[PDB]
Amino acid sequence: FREVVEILDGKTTIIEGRITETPQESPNPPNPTGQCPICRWNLKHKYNYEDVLLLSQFIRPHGGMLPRRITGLCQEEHLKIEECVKMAHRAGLLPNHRPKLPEGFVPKSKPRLNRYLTRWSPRSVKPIYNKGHRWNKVRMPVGSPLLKDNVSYSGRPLLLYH
């Protein structure tokens, strides 16, 4: 991995690019002929929002996702992983992947509401005051439709709207 360091001395600035050792891929993938990382490690339709050990492999230290041209994923797997990362960040998983602000960490606010499988942004949803009757019912989306193809051991389809 590459880092940029800045040095200031006597109104003179020097920026340097330092390369440190980075982890490499594990020696034995179960499906070596796959052209895609997830699809060759046999994790397709196998991860969820709570699999942080996989979701944190490729995200920036401040929580941002990594570009597809760098990660190597196929488009659908990239979208699924991006949605899973968003859901984990909203649920509260990955607590060390946030920027550090000492000035803003002191003014504590109201306690965070526990949540999980959150599809939309918490600040963009309006409360459903009407809620409809049985024939026209306003359903609350839960989870994401991108993960509707995950393996279901019980056989019951996931309730994405409830």
Binding site: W120, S121, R123, S124, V125, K126
Partner: protein, 38 residues
């Protein structure tokens, strides 16, 4: 801002951004091109 059902860019400087759950045509050169998806 004009609230519309279909958003279209009226120049080359209009950019489409998703905010507050809606889609927006924001324009800086021509502020009259501000459109909000209903």
């Amino acid at each position: 801002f004009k609230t519309k059902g279909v958003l279209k860019k009226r120049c080359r400087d209009c950019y489409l951004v998703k905010r507050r759950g809606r889609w927006f045509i924001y324009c800086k050169t021509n502020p009259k091109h501000k459109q909000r998806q209903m």
